[PDB]
Structures are given as C-alpha cells and as structure tokens.
C-alpha cells in the first residue's frame, strides 16, 4: 500500500473516466456532499426495507 490524499485519489479516479482532474478540485465540496448524502440514502433504504 502507498499512501495518497483521498482528494487526489478521487482526482485520479475522475481522470480514469475521461473527466479532467480540475473538474474534481473545482467541485470538491460538492462531490463530497453528494457522496455523504448518497451514503445516507443507503442507510435509510436498508433501515426502511428488508
């Protein structure tokens, strides 16, 4: 394992789908808030129904 800052790991993972790195760094708070919100929907879905 090689350490890397998670914001830079997500910039590499964006660069892996043909979206340029700056699209993440210029939107990092939005991308974090969309991810944190989406993990919240997973919890609530799994609490709601078996």
């Amino acid at each position: 394992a090689l350490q890397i800052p998670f914001a830079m790991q997500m910039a590499y993972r964006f660069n892996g789908i043909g979206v340029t790195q700056n699209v993440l760094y210029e939107n990092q708070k939005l991308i974090a808030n969309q991810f944190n919100s989406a993990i919240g929907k997973i919890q609530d879905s799994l609490s709601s129904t078996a």
Binding site: A7, Y12, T20, N22, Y25, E26
Partner: protein
C-alpha cells in the same frame, strides 16, 4: 497533464505515478484551469515557460 506533483523537501517536481522520475515543472507538463482561490490544498511555486529563454536569445 499526466502524473502528480511531488516535493523532495524543498523543490517541487512533477512525476509519473508508477515510477519516481522527477521533472522540472513546466507549461508542457501541466495545464491551467482557473484562479488559485478554488482548489483546497494548492501550493505556491514557479512554473517554467520553456519559450522564454528562446525569446531571450
């Protein structure tokens, strides 16, 4: 453009990801987008424009 920015403790370099090869940071290694204020964790450094010594001839 490809690779990552890296510092040896005092200098700044750009390298490919999977093998350490330090290159002097330049406008052909990099691309601009927008002003400094937006990027979280940005740092100040020179970026060398390789044309300027050619024009200085």
């Amino acid at each position: 453009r490809e690779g990552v920015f890296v510092s040896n403790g005092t200098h700044w370099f750009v390298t490919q990801r999977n093998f350490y090869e330090p290159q002097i940071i330049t406008t052909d290694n990099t691309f601009v987008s927008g002003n400094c204020d937006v990027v979280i964790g940005i740092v100040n450094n020179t970026v060398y424009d390789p044309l300027q010594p050619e024009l200085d001839s």
